[PDB]
Amino acid sequence: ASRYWVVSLPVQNSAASVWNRLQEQISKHSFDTPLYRFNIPNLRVGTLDSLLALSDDLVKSNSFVESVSHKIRRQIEELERVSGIESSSLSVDGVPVDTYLTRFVWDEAKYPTMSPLREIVDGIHTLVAKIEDDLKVRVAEYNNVRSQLNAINRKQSGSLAVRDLSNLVKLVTLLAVVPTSYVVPRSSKLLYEDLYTVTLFGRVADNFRIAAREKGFQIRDFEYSSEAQESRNQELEKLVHDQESLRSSLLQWCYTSYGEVFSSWMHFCAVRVFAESILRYGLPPSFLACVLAPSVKGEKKVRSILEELCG
Amino acid sequence: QMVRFIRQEAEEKANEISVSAEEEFNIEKLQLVEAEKKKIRQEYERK
């Protein structure tokens, strides 16, 4: 998927034409930059030591967000049936990417406490970790289903080395010798063709051994009753269908968890807005930056505008 | 041709089993006909 791409600028360091022009009427419209934002400050902010601790923990928060993003982009997509949750279905904080990135409403009481965010950030991180753990549980279930997939049906289709009971003829044994007269009633022909059958009888072992493995190429043994092979094939088909359903229904829940993780990442970006505001401005949360996924030219223009607060 | 030989084999097995049973039958009969001179020393000699 896409990693974090939010800009860093406090309320006092807006890069637009005006301080309040970051949301709209900025020069970014001329350059077609998709940047958009909306303020959503917390109830209160911590002290300078609390701000430094939050800045230190922001690295761990970003690492957790990256882990959640990698899990969502890998586990769902690899199943080839879980990527059906679009941006609207995976809307962050209930709003699509068009509106989720244009506001910080995820700072409401769902993941944080709408309060001093020094511990609310850690609580939201723990909630996102729980969501990622649920996604990992879904991925493990998908892996176990895939283990149920590629079942006994993966063997040969009968009259061969493996799963040859499905092509059995059901004193005689399953031989299916692929490329005789005696006292025994060797005048017989089994139905062991997926292969060929040969004259054999159990009354005298000479004809049976001659037909089975005595000369030429030795035949391959198989289960006498084809009912067991049919049951195994049916179980394999059922397991494959269950794995496909899990990749389509259980992995649909995984995609829903991925949308929840996107909401958690939106909340993390909302928290990081206040973190940057504290880092490069006063303690109270107030930011005028923007979050989007622009082109190289738009980012360069934004950096040229904001060079007054360059890194 | 060995289909009839299966009947012969079964008859031979049954004959062997019957011969063993008859051979043990004499011993079983003698187990009661004989040694009762000892058991009568407890069943009635006690009286």
Curated annotation (Swiss-Prot), chain B:
Annotated disulfide bonds: none
Record field: transmembrane: none
Domain of life: Eukaryota
Subunit and interaction comment: V-ATPase is a heteromultimeric enzyme composed of a peripheral catalytic V1 complex (components A to H) attached to an integral membrane V0 proton pore complex (components: a, c, c', c'' and d).
Record function comment: Subunit of the peripheral V1 complex of vacuolar ATPase essential for assembly or catalytic function. V-ATPase is responsible for acidifying a variety of intracellular compartments in eukaryotic cells.
Family to which the UniProt record says this protein belongs: Belongs to the V-ATPase E subunit family.
Protein name: V-type proton ATPase subunit E
Organism: Citrus unshiu (Satsuma mandarin)
Lineage: Eukaryota, Viridiplantae, Streptophyta, Embryophyta, Tracheophyta
Parent-protein start and end of this portion: 12 to 58 of 230
